[PDB]
Design a protein around this nucleic acid. Structure first.
Ligand code: CA
Ligand code: CA
Length: 313
DNA sequence: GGTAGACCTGGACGC
DNA sequence: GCGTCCAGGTCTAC
């Protein structure tokens, strides 16, 4: 069989993971600005690269159905399904988090009723780092294209489904290579093309390579966030996205225009310790602290729910 | 130390 | 049709 698979077309090639919609809604997570590597190639079926292999995912009321494209088609093995469980951090019980947040935040409770299943993906540091470097002063649709062209040009070719060729995310070496910036500009990444080249070189030639980034996962939020900000193209918001989505800092709250609108419209929030009236390094930091005092240790996760809901509105 | 102004790109809107 | 806005912001002279 050729092309992207559907649960109905190739039954024997799918394996499931127990998962109710209250725990995960692919349609509210995958195209919402966390990861830019997933596409709904066929109604309700999402395809993308996960743990260096291509996968298609789809769900029914109580199951998350998975299929992987590696030779000789066969359903995913238990070890491979584990990769999926970990990518979606399925050990974190979303129902428990929603309950808590909703208990201390009447507005969250209201929104939560209509937007269940919004959880945080646990992403690869490099993929997350450069994808978000590409996200600044930009929109999800455009960002998604940039990331795809980036991987196509500098990432390992994996497999082809229909007319779509999947690529693994580029390595630091590839991104640090000669003339990467110029090539990325022709691929339409704008001024961020330099940020990509410059940051790849900085990590490899000034910070000590991959080890420096990966170690941030063991470091403290304050530690990690400060470290990331030295990288070209990485500001407070991008750094926060990375901490939350790739370095296991569930309290990190990225503050962008969306979160500002939410704060003002749904909580009548306004800076008090800062000086400005709108977004600024001072007010942004304050808003982040506000969201943390409101939701607690997993504030970044709560923010993700409202962000996702704000997109679909 | 804290501020607006510029900035690649392309889909939206309003004149 | 076409100039101003804006999107998961960051980087800088005054
Ligand atoms: Ca903006
Ligand atoms: Ca920086």
């Amino acid at each position: 069989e050729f092309g992207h698979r559907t649960l109905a077309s190739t039954p024997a090639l799918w394996a499931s993971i127990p998962c109710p919609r209250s725990e995960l809604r692919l349609d509210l997570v995958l195209p919402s600005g966390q990861s830019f590597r997933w596409r709904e190639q066929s109604p309700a079926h999402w395809s993308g690269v996960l743990a260096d292999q291509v996968w298609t995912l789809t769900q029914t009321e109580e199951q998350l159905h998975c299929t992987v494209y590696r030779s000789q088609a066969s359903r995913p093995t238990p070890d491979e399904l584990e990769a999926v469980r970990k990518y979606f951090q399925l050990d974190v019980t979303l129902a428990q988090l929603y309950h808590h947040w909703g208990s201390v935040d009447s507005h969250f409770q209201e929104v939560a009723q209509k937007f269940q299943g919004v959880r945080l993906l646990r992403q690869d540091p490099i993929e997350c780092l450069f994808s978000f470097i590409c996200s600044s002063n930009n929109n999800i649709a455009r960002i998604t294209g940039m990331v795809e062209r980036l991987c196509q040009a500098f990432g390992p070719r994996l497999i082809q489904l229909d007319d779509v060729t999947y690529h693994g995310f580029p390595s630091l070496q590839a991104l640090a290579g000669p003339e990467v910036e110029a090539h990325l500009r022709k691929l339409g990444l704008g001024y961020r093309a330099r940020y990509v080249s410059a940051s790849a070189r900085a990590i490899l030639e000034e910070q000590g390579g991959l080890a420096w980034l990966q170690q941030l996962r063991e470091s403290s939020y304050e530690e990690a966030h400060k470290a990331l900000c030295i990288l070209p193209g990485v500001g407070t918001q991008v750094a926060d996205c990375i901490c939350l989505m790739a370095l296991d800092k569930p309290q990190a709250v990225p503050v962008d225009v969306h979160m500002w609108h939410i704060a003002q419209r749904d909580y009548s929030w306004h800076p008090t310790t800062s000086q400005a009236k709108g977004p600024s390094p001072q007010t942004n930091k304050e808003l982040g602290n506000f969201f943390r005092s409101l939701w607690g240790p997993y504030a970044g996760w709560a923010a993700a729910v409202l962000f996702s809901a704000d997109l679909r509105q």
